[PDB]
């Protein structure tokens, strides 16, 4: 019926003076733009059809052509940036915002998904969508006493579109818009659908990926305990953004980092630091390295939760990028820790796997490991136990590796290497 039309036939119908013929052809356009293999988006754009689709968005008297053109436009705007720009340049943004008020749920849903695709393309279109007024009508679609009375697909699409309005930097979204959306996000973060929860966590992770004032807007709304709960979810699409958000929050102040600790986050890290998905392990170890760069009482809480062995574990055997983050976590720990805390670190077995990593290609990890070694010796000096430590390092191949590093391309590597050797060997 409307199956496998040519662009030429689509054009001939859309240019007829016949609203039913126009509807037929708009639907044929939607079906073309919907096919899995290589939809002819650019042919459709080249034919000049975007303006005609956009004009059909306003035919309130013919809601099916509103729907078909909204869905055709949506498949264009989900493409490449130039394709999305063709939709924006056709005037689609305010036409879609108007359709958020449609009494046809399936039409306003299409308008939600179209605006998510436009806003997601980047910061400028994100802010343009906001400037045309999309936030109020979007949030009004969620102003119901129980989100569970909304259709599942519809709620998922609203959540996803809201997260794209939270997305991207340079610049980050307008402060007034974030404050407007955050209360709804907080509510979505307590909805029991795994996808709503994933996308809510993604939104929070974007908002926390910034300076400490942005983090504070989020932490003030009280979401950290819920984020930590979601950190323990079974569904990886939830854990991944929950962990990204928590990882972001601990790049902030000590007081913001403390909320994460107070909320119980550290009790999940035994699993996170052994997780079979390499990105979860990397991200969890980076989060640990930010925490070990905090106050001594915060280092102590890493200690008390039994996490130092897990860091020894990750340093010993992990993806190389994860071993690198774990090396940072140890250097931070030894820079900021008490002597007693550094003793404990050595007793858990950090020295051997530290040494074994000195034979790595990365110049930066070598710098990091050498710093930590120096910090450990500085703790040994305060106990006059440098000798017992030099033996340890001599006993697990450590000393061979350091002698060799005096002859190293980088300056800082040469210097620190030969310094340690003269000072303690």
Swiss-Prot record:
Residues 71-167 are annotated as: NLS binding site (major). The chain holds residues 72 to 496 of 529 of the full protein. Consists of an N-terminal hydrophilic region, a hydrophobic central region composed of 10 repeats, and a short hydrophilic C-terminus. The N-terminal hydrophilic region contains the importin beta binding domain (IBB domain), which is sufficient for binding importin beta and essential for nuclear protein import. The keyword Transport applies. The gene is Kpna2. Keywords: Acetylation, Cytoplasm, Nucleus, Phosphoprotein, Protein transport, Repeat, Transport, Ubl conjugation. Ubiquitinated. Deubiquitinated by USP22; leading to stabilization and increased activity. Signal peptide: none annotated. GO terms for cellular component: cytoplasmic stress granule; cytosol; glutamatergic synapse; host cell; NLS-dependent protein nuclear import complex; nucleoplasm; postsynaptic density. Heterodimer; with KPNB1. Component of a complex containing CSE1L, RAN and KPNA2. Interacts directly with CSE1L. Interacts with PLAG1. Interacts with APEX1 (via N-terminus). Interacts with FRG1 (via N-terminus). Interacts with ARL4A, CTNNBL1 and NBN. Interacts with ANP32E. Interacts with SNAI1 (via zinc fingers). Interacts with SNAI2 (via zinc fingers). Interacts with BAG6. Interacts with AIFM2; this interaction likely mediates the translocation of AIFM2 into the nucleus upon oxidative stress. Interacts with RSL1D1. Slightly detected in brain but not in cerebellum and skeletal muscle, highly expressed in testis and spleen. Residues 244-332 are annotated as: NLS binding site (minor). The keyword Repeat applies. This is Importin subunit alpha-1. GO terms for molecular function: DNA-binding transcription factor binding; nuclear import signal receptor activity. ARM repeats lie at residues 1-40, 41-80, 81-122, 129-173, 175-211, 212-251, 254-293, 296-338, 339-385, 386-425. GO terms for biological process: entry of viral genome into host nucleus through nuclear pore complex via importin; positive regulation of viral life cycle; postsynapse to nucleus signaling pathway; protein import into nucleus. Functions in nuclear protein import as an adapter protein for nuclear receptor KPNB1. Binds specifically and directly to substrates containing either a simple or bipartite NLS motif. Docking of the importin/substrate complex to the nuclear pore complex (NPC) is mediated by KPNB1 through binding to nucleoporin FxFG repeats and the complex is subsequently translocated through the pore by an energy requiring, Ran-dependent mechanism. Belongs to the importin alpha family.
């Amino acid at each position: 019926g409307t199956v496998n039309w040519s662009v030429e036939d689509i054009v001939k119908g859309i240019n007829s003076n016949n609203l039913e013929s126009q509807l037929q052809a708009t639907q044929a356009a939607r079906k073309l733009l919907s096919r899995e293999k290589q939809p002819p988006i650019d042919n459709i754009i080249r034919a000049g059809l975007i303006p005609k689709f956009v004009s059909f968005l306003g035919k309130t008297d013919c809601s099916p052509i509103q729907f078909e053109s909204a869905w055709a436009l949506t498949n264009i705007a989900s493409g490449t940036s130039e394709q999305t720009k063709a939709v924006v340049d056709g005037g689609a943004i305010p036409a879609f915002i108007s359709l958020l008020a449609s009494p046809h749920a399936h039409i306003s849903e299409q308008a939600v998904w179209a605006l998510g695709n436009i806003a997601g393309d980047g910061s400028a279109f994100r802010d343009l969508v906001i400037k045309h007024g999309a936030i109020d009508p979007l949030l009004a679609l969620l102003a119901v006493p129980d989100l569970s009375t909304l259709a599942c697909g519809y709620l998922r699409n609203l959540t996803w579109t809201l997260s794209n309005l939270c997305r991207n930097k340079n610049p980050a979204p307008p402060l007034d818009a974030v404050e407007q959306i955050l209360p709804t996000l907080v509510r979505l973060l307590h909805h029991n659908d795994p996808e709503v929860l994933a996308d809510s966590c993604w939104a929070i992770s974007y908002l926390t990926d910034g300076p400490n004032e942005r983090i504070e807007m989020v932490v003030k709304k009280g979401v950290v305990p819920q984020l930590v709960k979601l950190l323990g979810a079974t569904e990886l699409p939830i854990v991944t953004p929950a962990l990204r958000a928590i990882g972001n929050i601990v790049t902030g102040t000590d007081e913001q980092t403390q909320k994460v600790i107070d909320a119980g986050a550290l009790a999940v890290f035994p699993s996170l630091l052994t997780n079979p998905k390499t990105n979860i392990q990397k991200e969890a170890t980076r989060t640990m390295s930010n925490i070990t760069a905090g106050r001594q009482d915060q280092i102590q809480q890493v200690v008390n939760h039994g996490l130092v062995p897990f860091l020894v574990g990750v340093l010993s055997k992990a993806d190389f990028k994860t071993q690198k983050e774990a090396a940072r976590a140890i250097t931070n720990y030894t820079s900021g820790g008490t002597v007693e805390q550094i003793v404990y670190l050595v007793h858990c077995g950090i020295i051997e796997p530290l040494m074994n990593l000195l034979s790595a290609k990365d110049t930066k990890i070598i710098q990091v490991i050498l710093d930590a070694i120096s910090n450990i010796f500085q703790a040994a000096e305060k106990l006059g136990e440098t000798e017992k430590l030099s033996i340890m390092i001599e006993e697990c191949g450590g000393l061979d590796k350091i002698e060799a590093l005096q002859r190293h391309e980088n300056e800082s590597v040469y210097k620190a290497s030969l310094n340690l050797i003269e000072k303690y060997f």
